[PDB]
Design an enzyme around this catalytic site. Structure first.
Site, PDB file in Angstrom:
ATOM      1  N   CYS A 104       1.883   1.857   6.317  1.00  9.85           N
ATOM      2  CA  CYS A 104       3.408   2.431   6.527  1.00  9.85           C
ATOM      3  C   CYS A 104       3.439   3.839   7.034  1.00  9.85           C
ATOM      4  CB  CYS A 104       4.028   1.923   5.510  1.00  9.85           C
ATOM      5  SG  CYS A 104       5.806   2.220   5.833  1.00  9.85           S
ATOM      6  N   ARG A 107       6.909   6.411   5.228  1.00  7.41           N
ATOM      7  CA  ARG A 107       6.968   6.402   3.577  1.00  7.41           C
ATOM      8  C   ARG A 107       7.748   7.680   3.325  1.00  7.41           C
ATOM      9  NH1 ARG A 107       1.109   5.725   1.782  1.00  7.41           N
ATOM     10  NH2 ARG A 107       0.289   5.649   3.801  1.00  7.41           N
TER      11      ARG A 107
END
Ligand code: HEM
Ligand code: HEM
Ligand SMILES: Cc1cc(N)nc(COc2cc(CCN3CCC(F)(F)CC3)cc(F)c2F)c1
Ligand SMILES: Cc1cc(N)nc(COc2cc(CCN3CCC(F)(F)CC3)cc(F)c2F)c1
Ligand SMILES: C[C@H](O)[C@H](O)[C@H]1CNc2nc(N)[nH]c(=O)c2N1
Ligand SMILES: C[C@H](O)[C@H](O)[C@H]1CNc2nc(N)[nH]c(=O)c2N1
Ligand SMILES: [Ca+2]
Ligand SMILES: [Cl-]
Ligand SMILES: [Cl-]
Ligand SMILES: [Gd]
Ligand SMILES: [Gd]
Ligand SMILES: [Zn+2]
Lengths: 400, 402
Positions: A104, A107
């Site tokens: 991801c 973050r």
């Protein structure tokens, strides 16, 4: 023992000391690296270590409440074989699992997440109400807000809460007698299930699918989403006036509904989470992948590009304009979106913040680097270390 | 089982059986993957040599033959008497092609069977070394119709220094540490530039000054050799429709010739073995001209294109980078110099993976290096899962000789 990690634009060196706490095992060995693959009662011990993390996280370690929670969970599992998270521990595990997600790029946001406790849920008609709360809260009329809803944990002997759809919002994928697909090819399987468990198929390219929600030990139930609930963005281009007539659209809220959340040995097989989009997710992957909408040549034809020789870079020029259309259309509609330059610049800041918070940050280079303009973003030049910390989100077998 | 590999564009699945044959170990463990890091004895000589000989005799479909038995016996005896052995000429040609074939980070391996091998193992001085290199440059450049080539200098042997080529590439632009802290020229070449001056090179002050060669013969300090300007084919950069672009005064050289890797064949090591192919346009366009730590022209091109550079959301960086890549391809094709764009390069690499699957049951590939630095998911290798591992023979990094 401590990986040296270099940034080639700047020359800066750090060491990743957090990779020592890697709780599980990844797919690579000294013989071969597999990082490019997409999918490659002693429960007390996980439960214990997560509590230590939690109390260390609030600077209350070895203290009063620390030792009480420990004997609490011990007693709960001794009496039933599982145990219950405090609502605060649940909030903390949720944020950490996001914070530990190696793939991801978003973050930098990990501290701001709205956790919706839905562990008192039973029946799919209640799932559906929990989900619509989530969707309404997270959408917020286009000013997007991160969120997760946590359904009851798996426990022995009992069924399971599963959301059969991979996302809460997905366009249908219909097969035709010429073998091809109308709509989203990624969804041909979930679409035929929807039809087979009741749903009446539309016939357009952007028909929003229903929800196939499954409560413990009953078949799944259809639930149609109210149209005023699912916010969508019609795609147009700031200067190519024909772009709007292509009829392209996408939805506002990326909300992933089929990943399993794991906290201190507990496992939540339904815990959907949502943020906002990076523009390349929509414009490059969803619309330009050859096995998704695959619109690249349509746009290139409309731009009057030369498509019979690869070296005019017509594929590259059309891709950029589709991404421009995406960004312009979301902004015009005041829906939260972020471009891959701004996003990768914030991930750099996150890496620096985490280098000081915990000595490193698990990251999967292939997923951090955006799918267009790779080396034009600072993360391309950042070496990264990928490992698995817990708590965590994990893929899980389909419910069939 | 062996690693199951998937192509997501097509749906297809393979198993990489070849990886099981990986000898030397990589940097990854079950604890942590370092795939993104750039730079992370008689009986072992014989076992490498044996395995290499077996490879050669499989290549020509003569495994188990009498000649195969005899060559193994022959290698065994030479190692037992001298502690080393010599390759036959045919083994050396095959070994250099295999090293290219085995290189996980090279996207142009469809070409691995068409490689011209110059045997320079009888080279005896730095002057003869320079002569071998000029002949290499001349052969491979071929007035713009580039030909792949490698020149193998003598192998490392005990009791004598190595041949080395100090330059990382045969043709590089000087990078002069400017007085105010900046750089005029190519910043990647500041170190080798300062070593050339210190070794007696009188420098220039352009942005595109070709560096001389520092060649090291065994047990000797390096010697300085100027490349003859007529040997160094260069391409002026212009854009097919952006006429001011030529006013930038940009140039790049025709021939990409890596000179600082070590070639390893059957346990023998060749510290000097420069190899060259032809460029993929993104190496010049995106990396050499738009890296912020390289020539870093992206913002200047964007302003001249009259793009709104004050916010990232207009994607000015993407737009300018595309036109720079257009200029490079147009300029090489106009000058009649071989070049390949990243769509063609990556499509041919997909064909290579399919051949290798049929031929050997796998193909070592480093995904982060095969996916080009712009437009990644627009190329087919983006969607191809890959397995990275070390086979021998091989090209290897080696310490800088100073
Ligand atoms: C708020 C803005 C966010 C942005 C811009 C963002 C961006 C991204 C992107 C680009 C990916 C790569 C996915 C792909 O292309 O296939 C990803 C993956 C992921 N995200 Fe985030 N995300 C955000 C929020 C969140 C939140 C709120 C959570 C959970 C609490 C989360 C958890 C994950 C996980 C687990 C993955 C891995 C999924 C996979 O492996 O495909 N993200 N994100
Ligand atoms: C014929 C056309 C060729 C093309 C288009 C090509 C292309 C490339 C590219 C794009 C890379 C990535 C390098 C970077 O980004 O810096 C690469 C790496 C590499 N190539 Fe090829 N190449 C060609 C020929 C050759 C030949 C003839 C050899 C050896 C005989 C070779 C051996 C290698 C090696 C060892 C690497 C990896 C070097 C490293 O690890 O840094 N290539 N090539
Ligand atoms: C909160 C959030 C924000 C954001 N901006 N983006 C995401 C996207 O998160 C995922 C994206 C994908 C797509 C990639 N691909 C789909 C098909 C496959 F499952 F086969 C292999 C993975 C799969 C996942 F599981 C994900 F969580 C999530
Ligand atoms: C034969 C050939 C053909 C082609 N078309 N291209 C190449 C480029 O091959 C290399 C290019 C470079 C320079 C770029 N850069 C240097 C610093 C770094 F090491 F950090 C990363 C790579 C270093 C290498 F070792 C290489 F093999 C080689
Ligand atoms: C085969 C390869 O691993 C696969 O295409 C990966 C690569 N990188 C990715 N990166 C992101 N952000 N999303 C993806 O789905 C993928 N897919
Ligand atoms: C940190 C990162 O590995 C580094 O910048 C790599 C990424 N991929 C690359 N890929 C190629 N082909 N060439 C490169 O120089 C790089 N650089
Ligand atoms: Ca038919
Ligand atoms: Cl998506
Ligand atoms: Cl180069
Ligand atoms: Gd027209
Ligand atoms: Gd013009
Ligand atoms: Zn790895």
């Amino acid at each position: 023992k401590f990986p040296r990690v270099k940034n080639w634009e700047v020359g800066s060196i750090t060491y990743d000391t957090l990779s020592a706490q890697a709780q599980q095992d990844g797919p690579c060995t000294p013989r071969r690296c597999l990082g490019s693959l997409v999918f490659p009662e002693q429960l007390l011990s996980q439960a214990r270590d997560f509590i230590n993390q939690y109390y260390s996280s609030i600077k209350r370690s070895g203290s009063q409440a620390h030792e009480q929670r420990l004997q609490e969970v011990e007693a709960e599992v001794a009496a039933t074989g599982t145990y219950q998270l405090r609502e605060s521990e649940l909030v903390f595990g949720a944020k950490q699992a996001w914070r530990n997600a190696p793939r991801c790029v978003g973050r930098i946001q990990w501290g701001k997440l709205q956790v919706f406790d839905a562990r008192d849920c039973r029946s799919a008609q209640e799932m559906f109400t929990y989900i619509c709360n989530h969707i309404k809260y997270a959408t917020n009329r286009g000013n997007l807000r991160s969120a997760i809803t946590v359904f009851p944990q798996r426990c022995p002997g009992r069924g399971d809460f599963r959301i059969w759809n991979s996302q809460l919002v997905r366009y249908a994928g219909y097969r035709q007698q010429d073998g091809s697909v109308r709509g989203d090819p990624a969804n041909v399987e979930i679409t035929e299930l929807c039809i087979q468990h009741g749903w009446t198929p539309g016939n357009g390219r952007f028909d929003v699918l229903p929800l196939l929600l499954q409560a413990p030990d009953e078949p799944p139930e259809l639930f149609l989403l109210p149209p005023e609930l699912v916010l969508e963005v019609p795609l147009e281009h700031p200067t190519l006036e024909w772009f709007a007539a292509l009829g392209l659209r996408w939805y506002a809220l990326p909300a992933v509904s089929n990943m399993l959340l794991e906290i201190g040995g507990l496992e939540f097989p339904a815990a959907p989470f949502s943020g906002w989009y990076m523009s390349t997710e929509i414009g490059t992957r969803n619309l330009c992948d050859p096995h998704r909408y695959n619109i690249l040549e349509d746009v290139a034809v409309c731009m009057d590009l030369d498509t019979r020789t690869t070296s005019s870079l017509w594929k590259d020029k059309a891709a950029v304009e589709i991404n421009v259309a995406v960004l312009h259309s979301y902004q015009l509609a005041k829906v939260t979106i972020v471009d891959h330059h701004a996003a990768t610049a914030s991930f750099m800041k996150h890496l620096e913040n985490e280098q000081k918070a915990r000595g490193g940050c698990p990251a999967d280079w292939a997923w951090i680097v955006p799918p267009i303009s790779g080396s034009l973003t600072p993360v391309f030049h950042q070496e990264m270390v990928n490992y698995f910390l817990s708590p965590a989100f994990r893929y899980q077998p389909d419910p069939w």
